[PDB]
Design an enzyme around this catalytic site. Structure first.
Site, mmCIF file in Angstrom:
data_model
loop_
_atom_site.group_PDB
_atom_site.id
_atom_site.type_symbol
_atom_site.label_atom_id
_atom_site.label_comp_id
_atom_site.label_asym_id
_atom_site.label_seq_id
_atom_site.Cartn_x
_atom_site.Cartn_y
_atom_site.Cartn_z
ATOM 1 C CG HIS A 1 -1.826 -0.968 1.307
ATOM 2 N ND1 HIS A 1 -2.879 -1.221 0.480
ATOM 3 C CD2 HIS A 1 -2.208 -1.926 2.325
ATOM 4 C CE1 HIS A 1 -3.554 -2.706 0.702
ATOM 5 N NE2 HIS A 1 -2.991 -2.744 1.820
ATOM 6 C CB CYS B 1 -3.957 2.344 -2.154
ATOM 7 S SG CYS B 1 -2.565 1.330 -2.287
ATOM 8 C CG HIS C 1 -4.481 -2.218 -3.866
ATOM 9 N ND1 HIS C 1 -3.876 -2.282 -2.679
ATOM 10 C CD2 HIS C 1 -4.461 -3.238 -4.536
ATOM 11 C CE1 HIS C 1 -3.032 -3.400 -2.523
ATOM 12 N NE2 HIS C 1 -3.472 -4.027 -3.839
ATOM 13 C CG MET D 1 -7.210 1.164 -0.721
ATOM 14 S SD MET D 1 -6.061 -0.040 -0.405
ATOM 15 C CE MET D 1 -5.306 0.844 1.090
HETATM 16 CU CU LIG Z 1 -3.521 -0.538 -1.456
#
Ligand SMILES: [Cu+2]
Length: 99
Positions: free
Chosen positions: A37, A84, A87, A92
């Protein structure tokens, strides 16, 4: 405020994902699960006169062990959208309102 990067189950979400802070309050992003992340602020969706380079993580710096943090403090009042990198496509994304 503390914000988890991933649910324990590996869900690709910030927890919480839509919150409020006072100007000057530290946000502690904590690597949780489902990593890698990071946290980048969308320069098109943050208040005028904020440099997103100052509040985003370095592009190649990805959090890859549990408990790893990224700490940042926002001051300019307004709403900020962040995400993120890995993602983003998967939803995200988050939002913080500085008051
Ligand atoms: Cu992530």
């Amino acid at each position: 405020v503390e914000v988890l990067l991933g649910g324990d189950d590996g869900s690709e979400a910030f927890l919480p994902g839509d919150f409020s802070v006072a100007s000057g309050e530290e946000i502690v992003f904590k690597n949780n699960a489902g990593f890698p992340h990071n946290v980048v602020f969308d320069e098109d969706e943050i208040p005028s006169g904020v440099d997103a380079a100052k509040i985003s993580m370095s592009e190649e710096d990805l959090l890859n062990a549990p408990g790893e943090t990224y700490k940042v403090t926002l001051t300019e009042k307004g709403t900020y959208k962040f995400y993120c990198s890995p993602h983003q496509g998967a939803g995200m994304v988050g939002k913080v309102t500085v008051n």
